[PDB]
Enzyme design. Sequence first.
Site, PDB file in Angstrom:
ATOM      1  N   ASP A 144       0.769  -1.162   0.097  1.00  0.00           N
ATOM      2  CA  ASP A 144      -0.023   0.076  -0.081  1.00  0.00           C
ATOM      3  C   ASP A 144       0.767   1.127  -0.103  1.00  0.00           C
ATOM      4  OD1 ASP A 144      -2.186   1.808   0.302  1.00  0.00           O
ATOM      5  OD2 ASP A 144      -2.597   1.482   2.215  1.00  0.00           O
ATOM      6  N   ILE A 145       1.793   1.158  -0.981  1.00  0.00           N
ATOM      7  CA  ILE A 145       2.562   2.409  -1.339  1.00  0.00           C
ATOM      8  C   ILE A 145       1.809   3.504  -2.077  1.00  0.00           C
ATOM      9  CG2 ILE A 145       4.572   3.028  -2.588  1.00  0.00           C
ATOM     10  CD1 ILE A 145       4.903   0.529  -0.656  1.00  0.00           C
ATOM     11  N   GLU A 146       1.344   4.619  -1.460  1.00  0.00           N
ATOM     12  CA  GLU A 146       0.652   5.630  -1.701  1.00  0.00           C
ATOM     13  C   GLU A 146       1.596   7.184  -1.998  1.00  0.00           C
ATOM     14  OE1 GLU A 146      -2.180   5.992   1.334  1.00  0.00           O
ATOM     15  OE2 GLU A 146      -3.238   4.395   1.176  1.00  0.00           O
ATOM     16  N   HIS A 147       2.716   6.682  -1.953  1.00  0.00           N
ATOM     17  CA  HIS A 147       3.578   8.132  -2.168  1.00  0.00           C
ATOM     18  C   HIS A 147       4.926   7.947  -2.878  1.00  0.00           C
ATOM     19  CE1 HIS A 147       1.210  10.490   0.524  1.00  0.00           C
ATOM     20  NE2 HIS A 147       1.300   9.457   1.553  1.00  0.00           N
TER      21      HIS A 147
END
Length: 309
Positions: A144-147
């Site tokens: 859950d890499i959101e950056h």
Amino acid sequence: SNLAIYWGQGPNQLRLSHFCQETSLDIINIGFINYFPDMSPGHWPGSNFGNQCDGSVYVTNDGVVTKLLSGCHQIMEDIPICQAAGKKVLLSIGGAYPPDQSILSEDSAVAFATFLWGAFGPVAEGWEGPRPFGDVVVDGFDFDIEHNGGFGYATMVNTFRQYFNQVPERKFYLSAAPQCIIPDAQLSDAIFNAAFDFIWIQYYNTAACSAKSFIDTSLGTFNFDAWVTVLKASASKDAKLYVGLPASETAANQGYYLTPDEVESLVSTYMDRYPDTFGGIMLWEATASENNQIDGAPYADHMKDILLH
Ligand SMILES: CNC(=O)NC(=N)Nc1ccccc1
């Protein structure tokens, strides 16, 4: 079809053993390893689990105070219950906060993978690292890499999968959690160049392709179709795709929550079109679902009935 949910970051959460007893739930993602080695004290990853864990952090063979949680006693106790109940438990990497974390080389991404495998994977002899959850072995790892772009993640995935393949008796899982916009800046390289078992597109917080844009087609354009097409091209061609949803109006930005009737009409349309790739629903998150009690049951229970009906 399966119901996945997030737990770890719920204001005032109850302990994971509450959710282990929720029969509807088939997968629970634990968030988060949120401090990556490249910018964290000792090159160790760090963790945050909301209210859970006693606040103690490991210090290293060098006296370096890390960002990893060492007294996560309820989670250690609780992950086996969940698994004794049929549930897969994946440890999630990243999440929303803080927004300034990434991977700088292919070396640190092999080491990141290897550290998590040693740390929360199978108990292994020569391992001289932390065991934050004791002898518990998770079922997998959720991305859950959101950056900050997609560099490093296909490497971490294939490195993980490299490790999986040595444990032939046991079955381990890799998932990812993109946002709706195609191409996903964080995870499209990962999804393309490596095999994810599961992918749950977050269909909230972005207007141009939100799940609510299926109910109101003036808001943006719900794009699960475009996603089945890229999935087909990718190393994750055999991935099961999930429609990611907020479990209450107070779970993501205003207007992303869909009512069960709205969900059902989403689901019965895309379960039938892509019966071979459609996988189920994913919820953000466990606490919001708890507190969204619709006729004496939480939101997740009503999602699962939808999937079975
Ligand atoms: C599965 N990942 C998430 O659900 N992420 C998420 N909700 N991130 C977030 C982004 C902005 C504000 C709050 C949370």
